Each structure stands twice: as structure tokens, then as C-alpha cells.
Design a protein around this nucleic acid. Structure first.
Ligand code: ADP
Ligand code: BEF
Ligand code: MG
Lengths: 445, 607, 65, 9
DNA sequence: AAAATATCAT
DNA sequence: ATGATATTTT
């Protein structure tokens, strides 16, 4: 999703801002890697040629089969203003952005880069001992607060405010606490790379007047830096934002010099299993997860009963699923988490059942199911219980002198999509509270 | 718990955290987890050393839940007593448990097994001509026992009536009573010459179950628990044959008494000269020097009023000393009056055979001192894979209650409440559709219904037979035999009479429109009625078990509580909210609103 | 022309009967019976009946421990 | 698994 | 066909 | 402690 979500954010950026962004070669290289593979082919060809190339020739470059990919590639390039079209003498010529072209060329070859990539100090630090531990602790702490489980350490105020403003992990002052919404659980399910960009993108939106271009340049530059190998401390806005990243764990400072963190390398791009669990027809759960986070996240919708060093065992109960649904989690997410973390034994047994079913009747094909059907059905049914009775807020209109007026009002309410119930025999109809003002205004006129 | 840092999320576990103990280096091999505080055991059946571990754990633990992959066992004092009884000691148990444990056994667990593993064989009870002598080879220990006022080489005769009192008392005191009988040594009691027929062959699990009883070469009392249809009748027959003494069989029902007679005849060498049935139908008694006597609990247990003709046979039963006694369906022995059967009849070895060792009250544990320890048990899922008991796809159909019907449900009282949802018109349609659909597939369907009135009403509307208390023995047998061997009569209704202890391989499907209050025994027994289908080895075959309930009624509460035992054994219930193809059915009962109103008035007039 | 503030409740026949019974116990719960599948209830009592419904159905659910 | 289908009746 | 005692669940 | 259902006897 990063290959698309990050692209969408860049497209929304104004053209003038995008042109400024292309100044730094490091950002250009990152923006080069996010484009579709076919876009990479065309862009690289145009980097080393300082001349206009007609669009027809680029079309000829592609085969008949891959016409659809070409259409997507050109649209993506045009969206980001990478390709500037020019119409003259009845010819449609396309050229690369001079700022992007020069910066990208400088990155590939040896040339002035205005120290965009930073400067090496030749002071390496063991990663498996300190940087990795520091990165895990910071990510472990922030995630623990998100899940809601108690933890003595508290995330910094700046990150706490961002989460409060952020849609995920909604906080209610009246309740006096912070709770996980549907988006919050989705964030937990998403991998580390998706989670990191999820927070980073929100921070970029929140920041107003720290220049946006400066922040984006540092973030893209951060990916270029490799684990360890501190670099000398760069705009003033970058320095303060660097401190913010340090609170997030993306960067480690000894107090002078900042060591890039492993998460920074993961930020560049992608790259029995831990966290897997077994679900029985008896509704028991046994998770082979020793990580403290895995136990906490499971406890959100599972009634934990005991734990060993090797694994944690619990059971799904009406209380556990009811609690999760009340928080805001959907039953679809609950099954998704259980299935993705299925134990290999469950997968092997499910495959055997599928093979036997196919042998009995290969004509009919059904999807492979890892979890037992009964457990999934019970969880879905429990969700249906919450929506057993539906309540709407609105007003009821009746006692109409003429049937024509009632019909016109009912038709108008339905058109604007605010009619909840109607009955011609009684000449009554109930509308939603949101549309009450609109209906009243229409009645007056 | 020393030099261990509490976890941040340790608060989620209410003092049940077991992280202080460190995982063993070879944890990838050991298949067992031992919980110190609770004493529970978690076993992985997909790991090496699974098969012998399951056999060992069952011996030293009473299974709680046995799903496909993770098996949950528990250790109790009674379980330990049974384990030490069958040729075992603390040293062997401790070594094996530690070897199979992924983590070291805690000191608390070690103490629990140690305490109850030493009292095995101090006090013994034997039966002479008609006098019970609670004797022991040593003389010092018994003197301490005698000093107690509760009881009232040394051998002393104890009152026959008060035998149960001392048996429980011995359990209360540190030394529990042992029940062993060396049938080989004693020949004073006449010996019955019987052996299994050459054609007969004992199945693997049946052989293993009987081996535990005769592990030391001497018969010992106990309870053997096998799934319905496993063949407990053959296990009992083999047990009687090996002892080679007089055998008396007590059975729950006369119909099952006939089954025991036929089954005994079909699977052994005994001749009619040595077989007599003391049932209501006929009081014939055997005059041979020794033989088999099969009776029922009610006849033997009855105390106040018994006919003189029955009295003479009962006196005959109490007269001679018997060598073996089989308490078929031992799940009812702990009843208030049926307990007297053990005391009245003097037998050296007593064996109990039942499929569902479940009882609502706390009287189930009493069996351990009335007959003997739970010798053996078998997995329902394991036998299903082997092809011994037919696979069943249980279901729980949800039948919504219509608005007119539902309104009368709320106002009515509790006792009247039952008849509103049992006679739910939606439930009636569901029962009709399932019967019609499964009759098309040529499947015999048994529809249980505890409520007699509802049972008759459904049967009359559907033009199908029924069996219950009012039905005479001759008619009940005729329906059973007919339904087994006639194509036209594919489905028959039943009642509480047929819930337990009846054999009928033809039945494959099963429905229950109504059922008794929440009780796991009846659910398991009814399910077992179709677990011995002869067409169980055919490829891709699955029996069916349908439970019709009314939504939002108290039946939903009972049904969930009524299937707990099946869930523990492994069976899984699937909820069927919608029955596809029901709308297209040309005729559905109580389709018109007028019919529903007429039925509502008719059922309301009942109370 | 007359607007009456209230809350619209759409539910299955069984829930409708329970709501009516609650209204019988307390006449101020429900305002009108719009249809066999629709009722009008006072907004102040919406939460009370909503919580009450989940309590009455609790009798039909077997809670293990 | 039949959940969302119309209830029988 | 009517009596009387057990059993199983509230 | 009571109500169903079942069983045994006269
Ligand atoms: N060894 C065997 N070979 C074949 N059929 C057997 C064997 N053992 C038992 N059965 C069959 O199992 C069925 C049920 O036996 P039964 O003793 O009535 O079961 P339950 O355990 O329910 O009392 C009978 O049809 C019987 O013939
Ligand atoms: F367990 Be069986 F059906 F007697
Ligand atoms: Mg049997």
C-alpha cells in the first residue's frame, strides 16, 4: 500500500511545491523508486538525453500486450508533473522536468549534491546492542500506549497530541480515557513499514508553518542513510523535526551526533513464525508469542487465562468479543487477525480437508479456511447481537390536511436521503434529525 | 519464583503468570506444559511422543477438553488413585512427567502426586461365603483402623448393610479401600465354562480397555468409559468370560436387557441352560450349578413392595455368592435407591460400563467408592477417525418465533412457558423440511421429544409412529424391529424412554424438536443413538444430528448449556439461521395465519 | 403540519414485543407504535430501553462462569 | 455458513 | 385400568 | 420441596 499511498500524497502536493521538492537529489531518487516499473524505464532513458522526445516514440517503445501499463505509467508521470508536455507544429513533445532531471543525474554520477546525503564521521556503533534495542523500546512503548494496556513509561507530549488529533485511537474526555477505534486496530494489523508511514504521514499533515518542503526532504533523506555511521548535525526546522523523529525512535542522538536507526532503513522500502496461535473448536486460544506486545494486543478481544514463557493460552468468550465490538472493532478484523496468524498445524489440517473435499467432488471449488467454521460463525453472530435493535434520532411528521402535501414531503425527504420510515395509510413519515432542518425549510416554502 | 522480573502485562493474568520458570533447552521435543498453580496440563498431539503421552496422561489424569490439536488435562486425587492402582508408583510417575514436561515440574505439583501415591494397598476387603471380611496381612495398621468408632493378619466380619459406610470412610481416611479379587486362586464357587466364539475378534481399543482391568492378572473393580457404539457389551462379555465365574448383569431397561441376552448369545459359547432373565416380562430363573443372570435396576433396587414370585427369584439372587457383576449404564447407580444394588448383591469383582460419565449433582464422584476407579477412557474423535463410530455433523437450527406466538410467551408463567416454544409453528416447519429433505436421501430419521404432548402432536400431524411410557413392551419392540427392516417406515419419533441404552444401526439422521431441561447426559446419549450406523465405513459418509430451538426463548439458554459435554469431547455445533429450499416446499404446516391462531388456542387450552 | 421529536426504532418482531412490554411497565418509554416493524420512542428513554433490551435477552444466554 | 440469509419461516 | 415408588430436572 | 415421565404391581 506504501507504493500507492505515498504516491497519492505526493500527487496532492501543489505543482510549485513539487518543483521545489525535486531540488534535492536524494528526494528525487526516492520519488524515482515509487513510480511504476514502466515509468522507471522511460524516465531513465530521458535522464541522459537533453532533447525533446515525441510521445508517439514512447508508445512505440511498448509492445501491444503492455498497452494498459503504458497508460498507467504516463498518467502517473503527468500527475506528479514529472513529464512536461509541449504542443508545437502539430507535434506533442514530452520532456523531463529540468530540476528533477539535473538532480537525478547528480545522484547517479559523481557531482555536487550540496551534502544532501550528509557527511560521514567514521564512528560506528553496534546495532544489535543499542540502536536495535533503542528502536524496539521506542516503538514498543508507543504501540503499548496505542493498545491501551497499562505501561509506566508514557509517550512524549508531541506524539500524544498527534494521536489525539489523529483519527485512530480516539480519546474521549467525558470517559476520561483513550480507546482504540476501528482505524487503531487497522494500524496494529498493518506491518511495521505501513505503520511507520501511517504515523509519518499524519505528522506531515499536522505540521503547519517548520516548512513542509524541509520536513519532506529530511524524511526522504533519512531513508538514504544506512544503519549506524553517525552524520554531523541542516536547516533549523530540520533540527527541531529531527528531535521529533528521535522521540519516535527513527533517529538516535547520543545527546551532537545522531545515529540513523534501523527503522529509518525500513522506511526506505519493503525489506514456527512468532505470533502464531492455534484456535480450537472449543474456543480456546494458544499463542506462541513471547513478545509483550503480542500478549497485549491479543488481550484486547481475548480473555487471557494463564501464560508460560513459551506461549500464552486463553479463550474467546462473549465478554471478550463484546468488549472489542463496543470499542469500535469490527468482526471482520477479528477473524482477519486470527487467520493471518494461524499456526502451521491449522494450515496443514485445513489443506488436508480441502484435498479430501476436492477428491470427493472436484467439480465444486471452495476457498481454503484455516480457522474452524464454528468459531468464525459465533464471532459474526455476536456482532449481529449488538445491532439487534437499531435506534434513529429524528422527528415524526403527521396530521397533514391534504394527501398531496404529505406525498410531496415524503418524496422530497427520500430524494435528499433523510427519510427513515413512511406510511401512506396513516399519512405519517419519520425523518432523520440531520434532515429535519431541510424538510422544515422545504415545508415553509 | 525468584530472581524474576514481573512482566509489564503481568497484570492481565490474575496471579496465573508462570514466567518465573524458565523454558527447557529441549522444549521443541517435550509435548507437555504443566501449570503449577492450577495443576492443568496442556498437551500437543502434533508433536513427537504424542501417542504414548496421551495414553500416559489419561492414566494419571482425567481429560477435560480434547480438541483436534491441544488437549487439556487435569490432575486430581481420584485420578492419582486410579493411576497408582494399575501397577504404578510415584517414582515412575514423577520421572515420566518430568521427562515429557517442556518446563520443570513445580514443587507444589510434586507434593500433590506424592501424597496420594503411597496409600494404594494397606487395607483390603474380601468376601467369604456370605460374610464380608475387611482383613489385611499386616496386624499393626488394622489395629489403628479398628480403634476408630466410625467402623463397627487380622480379619473381622462387617455388617453387610454398613459396607458402603466403611468404604466411604476408608476414602475419607488416609488409606483408601482396594478392590481386587484373585479369581484364579478360588475354585470353591462353581465356575461357568464359557469362552468367546472363534469368529469373534476383540477390537484394538476394546482389548486395551480390558487389559487395564486385568493388568496384574487379577480382576479389579472399576468403570470403563467408551463412546456410544464402541461395543461396551462385548467388553463386558469378554470380562465375564475370562473370570470364569457366575456373572450377574444389571441393566437400565428391559428392552436393553433383551439386547444383552441376544448380544451375549451372539458373542459367546454360553447355552440357554445357564441363562435366565429376571425381568418384568418373565421371572424365569436358572437352575444350573452356575450361569448368567441378567436383570434390571428397578427390580433389584425395589425394597418396599415386590411380588412373592419376584421375591423368590430375588432371594435366589441374594442367596448364592457371585463372581462377577456388570453394572451396565453405571451413570444412574449414584441415584438415591439404585445404590442398594451393590450392597445387596455380594460379588467379588464389579465392573461399570457407560458412555457418558456425567451427572448434574455432585454424586458422580461417589462412583469411585461404590464400584471402583475409572480404569479406562477413549477419545470420541480418535475412534471416529479409525472408522469405529460414524462421523456426525452436529447442527443447532435457529427457529424464530412469530410475533403472535411470542407475545403469549412473555405473559405466561414459567411452567406454561415450555409449551409455547416447543409448539412453535416455525419450529414445526423446520422439522417437516428436515425430515422431508433427509428422507429423500434415504436416511432413517429419529425425532426425540421429551414432551409427550408435543411428541404426539408432531407424530399425528406427520402420520408417523412414536414410543413412550404408555406404549406396551410388545408394541415398542415391534416398532423398533419394523423401523429397522422396512423401507416404508423410514422415520419414527421417540421420547425419554429411548434416550439411553438402545441399539439401532439403521438410524443415521436425528432431530430433537423438544428436549428436557439443560442436561448434558441426555444430549450425549441421544447423539450416541446414531453413532453405530452400519454404513459408517462407506467413503464420504456423515451422519446428522439436528437440534431445533426457538430464538429468544429459554430453550436457547438450555441448548447452549445442554451441549457442553459434546464440545469438550470434540464435537462442534454449527448454527443454521436459514434453511435453503424451505420456501419452495409446496406445503408447509401452519402456513396461513388462521392455522397459527387455531394452534395457539389449542396449545393454550392445555393449561 | 406537525413535527413530533422522537426516536425511530426498527427491529425484529421479537424485539418489538419486548419493547411494548417495557412500555407497559413504564408508560413513558414508547410514544407510538408506527408499525409491526417500527416504533416511536421518547429520545430521553432511548438509552434506557436500549440497555433494558440487552438485559432481558441476557436470560436467554448461558454465561459460562 | 448461513448468517446473513433471511431467517426461515 | 388404577396405585405406588423412582428418577430426572426446576 | 414440586412437577414430568417412567416403571412395576395388583
Ligand atoms: N468387535 C466388534 N465387531 C463388530 N461389531 C461390534 C464389535 N463390538 C461391538 N460391535 C457392535 O457395536 C454395536 C453397539 O454395541 P453396544 O455394546 O450396544 O454399545 P454401547 O457401548 O452403546 O453399549 C453393536 O451393533 C455391536 O454388534
Ligand atoms: F453407550 Be451405548 F449407546 F449403550
Ligand atoms: Mg449400552
Amino acid at each position: 500500500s506504501l507504493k500507492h499511498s505515498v504516491t497519492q500524497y505526493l500527487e496532492e502536493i501543489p505543482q510549485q511545491v513539487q518543483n521545489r521538492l525535486y531540488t534535492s537529489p536524494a528526494t528525487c531518487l526516492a520519488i524515482y523508486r515509487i513510480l511504476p516499473p514502466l515509468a522507471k524505464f522511460f524516465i531513465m532513458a530521458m535522464v541522459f538525453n537533453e532533447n525533446e522526445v515525441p510521445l508517439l516514440d514512447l508508445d512505440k517503445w511498448v509492445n501491444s500486450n503492455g498497452k494498459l501499463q503504458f497508460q498507467n505509467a504516463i498518467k502517473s508521470m503527468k500527475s506528479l508533473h514529472l513529464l512536461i508536455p509541449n504542443k508545437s507544429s502539430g507535434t506533442l513533445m514530452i520532456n523531463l522536468n529540468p530540476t528533477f532531471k539535473i538532480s537525478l543525474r547528480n545522484a547517479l554520477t559523481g557531482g555536487e549534491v550540496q551534502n544532501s546525503f550528509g557527511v560521514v564521521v567514521e564512528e560506528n556503533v553496534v546495532s544489535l546492542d543499542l540502536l536495535d534495542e533503542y528502536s524496539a523500546n521506542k516503538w514498543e512503548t508507543i504501540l503499548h500506549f496505542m493498545v491501551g494496556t497499562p505501561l509506566a513509561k508514557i509517550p512524549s507530549e508531541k506524539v500524544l497530541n498527534l494521536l489525539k488529533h489523529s483519527k485512530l485511537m480516539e480519546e474521549v474526555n467525558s470517559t476520561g480515557e483513550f480507546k482504540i477505534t476501528n482505524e487503531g486496530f487497522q494500524f496494529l494489523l498493518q506491518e511495521i513499514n505501513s505503520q511507520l508511514w501511517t504515523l509519518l504521514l499524519q505528522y506531515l499533515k499536522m505540521i503547519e508553518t517548520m516548512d513542509l518542503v524541509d520536513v519532506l526532504h529530511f524524511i526522504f533523506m533519512l531513508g538514504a542513510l544506512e544503519v549506524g555511521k553517525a552524520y554531523k548535525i541542516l536547516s533549523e526546522t530540520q533540527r527541531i523535526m529531527l528531535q521529533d523523529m528521535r522521540d519516535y525512535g527513527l533517529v538516535f542522538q547520543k545527546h551532537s551526533i545522531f545515529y540513523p536507526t534501523k527503522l529509518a532503513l525500513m522506511l526506505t522500502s519493503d525489506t514456527i513464525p512468532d505470533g502464531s496461535l492455534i484456535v480450537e473448536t472449543n474456543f480456546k486460544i494458544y499463542s506462541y508469542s513471547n513478545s509483550p506486545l503480542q500478549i497485549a494486543v491479543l488481550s484486547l478481544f481475548v480473555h487471557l487465562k494463564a501464560r508460560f514463557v513459551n506461549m500464552v493460552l486463553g479463550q474467546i468468550t462473549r465478554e471478550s468479543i463484546r468488549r472489542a465490538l463496543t470499542n469500535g472493532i469490527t468482526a471482520d478484523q477479528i477473524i482477519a487477525y486470527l487467520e493471518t496468524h494461524a499456526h502451521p498445524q491449522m494450515r496443514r489440517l485445513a489443506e488436508e480437508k480441502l484435498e479430501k473435499k476436492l477428491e470427493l467432488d472436484p467439480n465444486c471449488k471452495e476457498p481454503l479456511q484455516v480457522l474452524p467454521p464454528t468459531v468464525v460463525d459465533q464471532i459474526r453472530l455476536w456482532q449481529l447481537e449488538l445491532d439487534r435493535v437499531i435506534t434513529y434520532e429524528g422527528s415524526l411528521y403527521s396530521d397533514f390536511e391534504t394527501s398531496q402535501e404529505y406525498n410531496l414531503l415524503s418524496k422530497y425527504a427520500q430524494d435528499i436521503g433523510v427519510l427513515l420510515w413512511k406510511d401512506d395509510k396513516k399519512k405519517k413519515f419519520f425523518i432523520s434529525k440531520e434532515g429535519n432542518s431541510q424538510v422544515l425549510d422545504f415545508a415553509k416554502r | 519464583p525468584a530472581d524474576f522480573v514481573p512482566d509489564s502485562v503481568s497484570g492481565m493474568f490474575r496471579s496465573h503468570d508462570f514466567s518465573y520458570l524458565r523454558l527447557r533447552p529441549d522444549h521443541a521435543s517435550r509435548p507437555l506444559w504443566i501449570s503449577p498453580s492450577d495443576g492443568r496440563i496442556i498437551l500437543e498431539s502434533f508433536s513427537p511422543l504424542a501417542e504414548q503421552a496421551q495414553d500416559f496422561l489419561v492414566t494419571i489424569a482425567e481429560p477435560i477438553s480434547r480438541p483436534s490439536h491441544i488437549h487439556e488435562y487435569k490432575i486430581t486425587a481420584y485420578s492419582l488413585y486410579a493411576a497408582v492402582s494399575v501397577g504404578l508408583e510415584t517414582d515412575d510417575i514423577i520421572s515420566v512427567l518430568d521427562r515429557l514436561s517442556k518446563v520443570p515440574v513445580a514443587e507444589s505439583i510434586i507434593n500433590f502426586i506424592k501424597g496420594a501415591t503411597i496409600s494404594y494397598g494397606k487395607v483390603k476387603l474380601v468376601i467369604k461365603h456370605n460374610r464380608y471380611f475387611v482383613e489385611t496381612t499386616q496386624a499393626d495398621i488394622l489395629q489403628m483402623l479398628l480403634n476408630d468408632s466410625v467402623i463397627g493378619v487380622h480379619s473381622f466380619e462387617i455388617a453387610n448393610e454398613s459396607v458402603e459406610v466403611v468404604k466411604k470412610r476408608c476414602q475419607e481416611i488416609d488409606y483408601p479401600v482396594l478392590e481386587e479379587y484373585d479369581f484364579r486362586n478360588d475354585h470353591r464357587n462353581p465356575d461357568l465354562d464359557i469362552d468367546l466364539k472363534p469368529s469373534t475378534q476383540i477390537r484394538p481399543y476394546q482389548e486395551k480397555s480390558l487389559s487395564k482391568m486385568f493388568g496384574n492378572g487379577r480382576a479389579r473393580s472399576g468403570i470403563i468409559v467408551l463412546p456410544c457404539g464402541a461395543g461396551k457389551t462385548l467388553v463386558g462379555i469378554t470380562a465375564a468370560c475370562t473370570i470364569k465365574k457366575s456373572v450377574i448383569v444389571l441393566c437400565t431397561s428391559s428392552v436393553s436387557v433383551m439386547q444383552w441376552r441376544q448380544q451375549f448369545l451372539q458373542w459367546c459359547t454360553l447355552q440357554p441352560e445357564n441363562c435366565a432373565v429376571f425381568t418384568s416380562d418373565n421371572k424365569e430363573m436358572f437352575q444350573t450349578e452356575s450361569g448368567l443372570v441378567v436383570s434390571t435396576y428397578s427390580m433389584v433396587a425395589n425394597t418396599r413392595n415386590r411380588s412373592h414370585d419376584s421375591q423368590k427369584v430375588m432371594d435366589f439372587l441374594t442367596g448364592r455368592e457371585w463372581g462377577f457383576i456388570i453394572l451396565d449404564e453405571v451413570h444412574v447407580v449414584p441415584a438415591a435407591m439404585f445404590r442398594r444394588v451393590v450392597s445387596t448383591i455380594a460379588a467379588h469383582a464389579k465392573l461399570g460400563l457407560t458412555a457418558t460419565l456425567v451427572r448434574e449433582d455432585d454424586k458422580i464422584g461417589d462412583l469411585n467408592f461404590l464400584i471402583g476407579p475409572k480404569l479406562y477412557e477413549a477419545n470420541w474423535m480418535e475412534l471416529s477417525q479409525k472408522g469405529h463410530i460414524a462421523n456426525v455433523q452436529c447442527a443447532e437450527v435457529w427457529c424464530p418465533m412469530t410475533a403472535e406466538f411470542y407475545q403469549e410467551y412473555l405473559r405466561e408463567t414459567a411452567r406454561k412457558r415450555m409449551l409455547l416454544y416447543i409448539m412453535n409453528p416455525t419450529k414445526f416447519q423446520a422439522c417437516q423440511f428436515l425430515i422431508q429433505y433427509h428422507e429423500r436421501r434415504g436416511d432413517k430419521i429419529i425425532v426425540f421429544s421429551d414432551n409427550v404432548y408435543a411428541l404426539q402432536e408432531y407424530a399425528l400431524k406427520m402420520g408417523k409412529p412414536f414410543i413412550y411410557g404408555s406404549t406396551p413392551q410388545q408394541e415398542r419392540m415391534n416398532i423398533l424391529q419394523n423401523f429397522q427392516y422396512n423401507d416404508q417406515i423410514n422415520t419414527i419419533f421417540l421420547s425419554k424412554v429411548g434416550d439411553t441404552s438402545i441399539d439401532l444401526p439403521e438410524a443415521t439422521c436425528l432431530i430433537q424438536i423438544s428436549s428436557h431441561y439443560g442436561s448434558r447426559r441426555q444430549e450425549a446419549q441421544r447423539l450416541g443413538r446414531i453413532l453405530r450406523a452400519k454404513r459408517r465405513n462407506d467413503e464420504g459418509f456423515n451422519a446428522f444430528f439436528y437440534s431445533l430451538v426457538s430464538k429468544d426463548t429459554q430453550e436457547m439458554y438450555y441448548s447452549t448449556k445442554r451441549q457442553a459435554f459434546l464440545v469438550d469431547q470434540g464435537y462442534a455445533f454449527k448454527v443454521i439461521t436459514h434453511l435453503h429450499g424451505m420456501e419452495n416446499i409446496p406445503n408447509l404446516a401452519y402456513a396461513s395465519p388462521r392455522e397459527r391462531r387455531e394452534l395457539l388456542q389449542e396449545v393454550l387450552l392445555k393449561n | 403540519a406537525r413535527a413530533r421529536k422522537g426516536a425511530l426504532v426498527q427491529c425484529d418482531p421479537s424485539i418489538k414485543a419486548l419493547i411494548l412490554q417495557i412500555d407497559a411497565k413504564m408508560s413513558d418509554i414508547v410514544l407510538e407504535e408506527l408499525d409491526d416493524t417500527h416504533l416511536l420512542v421518547n429520545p430521553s428513554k432511548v438509552e434506557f430501553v436500549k440497555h433494558e433490551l440487552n438485559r432481558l435477552l441476557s436470560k436467554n444466554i448461558y454465561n459460562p462462569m | 455458513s448461513t448468517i446473513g440469509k433471511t431467517a426461515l419461516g
